Amino acid sequence: TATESYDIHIARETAELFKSNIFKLQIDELLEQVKLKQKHVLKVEKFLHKLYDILQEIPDWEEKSLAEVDSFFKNKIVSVPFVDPKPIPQNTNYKFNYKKPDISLIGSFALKAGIYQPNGSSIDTLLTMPKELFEKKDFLNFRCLHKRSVYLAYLTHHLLILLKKDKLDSFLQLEYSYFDNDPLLPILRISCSKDYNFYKTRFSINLLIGFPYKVFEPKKLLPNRNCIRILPATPLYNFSVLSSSTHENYLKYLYKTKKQTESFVEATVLGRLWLQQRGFSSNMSHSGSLGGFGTFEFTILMAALLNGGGINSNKILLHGFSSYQLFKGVIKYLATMDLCHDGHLQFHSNPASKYIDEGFQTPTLFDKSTKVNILTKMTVSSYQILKEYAGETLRMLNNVVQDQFSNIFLTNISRFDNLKYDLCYDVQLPLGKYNNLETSLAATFGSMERVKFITLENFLAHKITNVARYALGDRIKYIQIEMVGQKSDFPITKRKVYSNTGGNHFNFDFVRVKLIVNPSECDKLVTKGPAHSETMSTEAAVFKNFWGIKSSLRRFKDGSITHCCVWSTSSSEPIISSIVNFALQKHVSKKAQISNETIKKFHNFLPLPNLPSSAKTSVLNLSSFFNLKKSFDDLYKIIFQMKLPLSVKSILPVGSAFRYTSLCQPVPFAYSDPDFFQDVILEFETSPKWPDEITSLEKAKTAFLLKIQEELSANSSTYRSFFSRDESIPYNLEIVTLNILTPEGYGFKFRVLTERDEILYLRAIANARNELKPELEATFLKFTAKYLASVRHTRTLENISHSYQFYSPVVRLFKRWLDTHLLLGHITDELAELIAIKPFVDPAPYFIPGSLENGFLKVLKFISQWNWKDDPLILDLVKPEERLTLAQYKGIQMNFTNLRNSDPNGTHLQFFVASKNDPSGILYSSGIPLPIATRLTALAKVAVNLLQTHGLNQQTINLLFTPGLKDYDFVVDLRTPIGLKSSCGILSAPSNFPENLNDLSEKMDPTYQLVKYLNLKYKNSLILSSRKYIGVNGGEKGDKNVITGLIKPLFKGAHKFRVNLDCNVKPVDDENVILNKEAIFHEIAAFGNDMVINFETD
């Protein structure tokens, strides 16, 4: 009913209003920003008018034999752009002629939907050859196309004459190209160099040669029909021929729809930009490009959805929809309504559009009026990717919290293949000439293939796609084959695009195979094939032939026996690399050379643990961490079950190993590793007997640890234990940890937490004089991070890591990178972890990372673009579709803006990083010196720039992990007397704990303590940085460290002598003093003494 409909409509409007209104204003602004100025439209319309005159003056010539046209052109500059197969005298009875064309405009310019493009835009001018130039059999065997090419050539010759005459040839540029990069459809392109000069408008003019509507029986050109007699259907060929007859038809259809629908043009601009950012266009995708779906296809789809589109032909879009509603509705349809394997859309350009739930296994948008499949230019692989981008955009459009406009329209994700995709393989294919293919190509490219695929390039891209898809199975989600160096333009003096690059005579330099990985399956040992039975099924025969020597039979745990291939894991590369190499060399070309060295370099920058079969262990394998947890679990039981004066309530392990983030994988007995001792929080049942002052409280806690240690030593003597001071909570001098060494070779440090602790820190803040409150706040923050927030941080990251399998190795590599640049000492592990998770929990408009390279580069890219003065980082630490609500998100944003009100430049707090775990945004990022924050940003920019400039390769990757050590006041080289690489558990093996536990210390980093105490002494005046992981980053033996020093800007000039200056100073007169550099240098040299090898000063 009308009232029912109205109520639903109002309910929906209200539900969508918040985002709808915001989006509209953003849309309005974008459209103004990209608006074509009327002066430019008018200026090209002036040239277009002259062009029409000139063209109208080209005289008809005469019916000519192929011999005659050949003679006509032989002596002239212009060549006929005959398509392959070019006509031979022996097989061409018909003849050729030119007569005056009907001129018309098509495309965006004709629909007045043009936008300002820095790169420029094309105006498509349609020149229809008269019907009498055609015989009704001309749709067959390239006849109409050869007629078309001569027609274009004759036109181009006479146009050149007439342009010379009007003096226009001095600023005009003429060249051949292919319409939509379709090699069957050469066109002429006119462009301007620096009154009819339209250079400043950024337009180019394409002269499209078309056929009259319905010159050939449309039913004879259906996708399932053959039109090249050699029979196999010729859908590619048929599309080129049939659509050459429908250009005006579609312009009329789109113009009519535009007139009916107020926001059509605006929605068209939104579609164009959305597709453009994602690397899509109308260009032919069959020859190794991402596309077949550009502005034209978007508008045709939108128009179809404005006249039905449901499974029962119901309207999807209404004529009164805002541009937001139109765009969103098209995206939603693309996301959810399958047009390839499971269905297709039928429409009538001349009646209601109907979704039909049978698929043709190729992208299909079928016009019942014209018999054209609008989506012919799209490969299956291009369509699958389009549908995923549509799904992601639909999710973004439904986000009622974080603003997605920039992600949707304003972010080019296509600039860098290594960010857009997870793995990219460069494939050299020196196939030689066409006559060489019998040996250079493993598959036959014969008569049937040429008829179906038209070009070798189409055949080759499809072959490589099909081979890689079958070989990789569920290891991947999406694939693109790219013909790199492919050209679309060629001189008017040439028949076609010619190439001799890449050791071949085809239109590409090499091929790039680009993958979106499936992390749950990508590095599995077994490629599963068909079931084994008595006689070979077709599927099993195919599998066996495809894999050859790699194929075997295997019994699975469930009792099944199937054909399979078994691969070897490697720490250095994904199994995918082996498979691509094997499959391409076997089934594409024996001459194929496959390389992907970038992924190996990133893999090899993760420290290799000294564990059995380490070099053969997947980067995705977490066994090291699982084995540590298993050891902990055994100890947990013993302590939890102990009879003590209070019962144990909780034992909560909170160390980096429990959330898979430790820089090095844990190795038994590797006690040199900074992360060897894993923190555990121990809580007893509540008790009113805990002391009400911090010294007595800590001693009471220690008394319980003593009882635990006593019981452990008595009845569980394969565990060893000792007590250690924790000096990291400033001014709490009595904290003791119980350090337990398990028989499996792992270390755990236990601290007690009571319900009294937080109360005492809060009381200390309340009691402190105003001047001191900041220091007590900082102490309380350190306490909170260690004892309170560590449990939720660890539980959250452990849990969601299962949905983000590449996060663990990515964050570990990120920490390694931070430590190589001496930053890790100032950046908490939690802050590093939360920055690194950004590309995983908030990937848009990219996909979630599916390789080590992809994730790591995304973290650096994020940092490079993060203006931490202006913007917070707010994370929804959840698995992919508990999320922050609108109110919660705005409340966190207000924490940031409040902070910036009194800290507008981020002098006190730079990186605001918040989540549901920490809405304050400052728990893990407080107390960082400003120069350290700026250096981190600077290094990320340096990294991104190095890669944009010099590309991603072995040399530039090495540079990412090399410190520059420039712009420092001083640099000190240290060497420890004993190398720690081995005892850190890194392969360049620890086997026991020392007899005397006092000797654990002999394999610990003395330079860590050195730098710790230097920072404590000189906190007021200097910033000192060093490596935290000497085993990892201290060279071949793990014995070299560096200290860099910065004098705080506060101490570069003189000051009044005051008793509380807290700086090593010298007098400059009897009233004023200045920092004394020479004395400080001698102090530092003396402090490190024999370990100080070199000391450089600015």
Partner: protein, 169 residues
């Protein structure tokens, strides 16, 4: 600069020659000293010292005062170095709250000891100008490998047990 023996606020300038290090290319460290005024009983006969050299301790300060006594044939006995918290570890009394950085006091055994030292320091402060080579070298305590790794060692269990057992009684 050599002519600056005392600062305007009453602090005497007390320079030391810095020992050589293999890794560095005769520089001075400047400590500052003034007589301490305190109505507090345990802060009697003290010099307030600003900018003590790295890792200053009672042994180093006794050596210094002894060199002064030898040079100027005088008698001065040092009792204690007070409030030398070079690493800032005791800057806030968390214990009290839950119920002068880079400076210290050098305490002498009696009024005569400090007076003698103070007179000797006055003459010491004029050496920079008159006889710079007569300034005393400060030889830093130089922590060994063992000293740095000691920070990692277990707490002594028997000391700990005793400490905890007694405090809890």
């Amino acid at each position: 600069i050599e002519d600056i023996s005392a600062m305007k606020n009453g602090f005497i300038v007390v320079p030391f020659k810095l020992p050589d290090h293999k890794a560095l290319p005769a520089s001075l460290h400047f400590m500052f000293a003034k007589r301490h005024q305190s109505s507090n009983s345990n802060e009697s006969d003290c010099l307030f010292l600003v900018n003590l050299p790295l890792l200053s301790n009672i042994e180093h300060m006794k050596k210094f005062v002894g060199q002064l006594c030898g040079k100027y044939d005088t008698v001065s006995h040092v009792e204690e170095l007070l409030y030398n918290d070079e690493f800032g570890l005791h800057e806030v009394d968390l214990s009290a709250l839950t119920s002068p950085r880079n400076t210290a006091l050098l305490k002498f055994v009696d009024a005569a000891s400090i007076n003698n030292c103070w007179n000797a320091l006055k003459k010491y402060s004029n050496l920079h100008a008159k006889h710079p080579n007569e300034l005393f070298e400060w030889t830093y305590t130089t922590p060994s490998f063992t000293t740095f790794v000691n920070f990692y060692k277990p707490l002594d269990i028997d000391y700990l047990k005793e400490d905890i057992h007694t405090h809890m009684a």
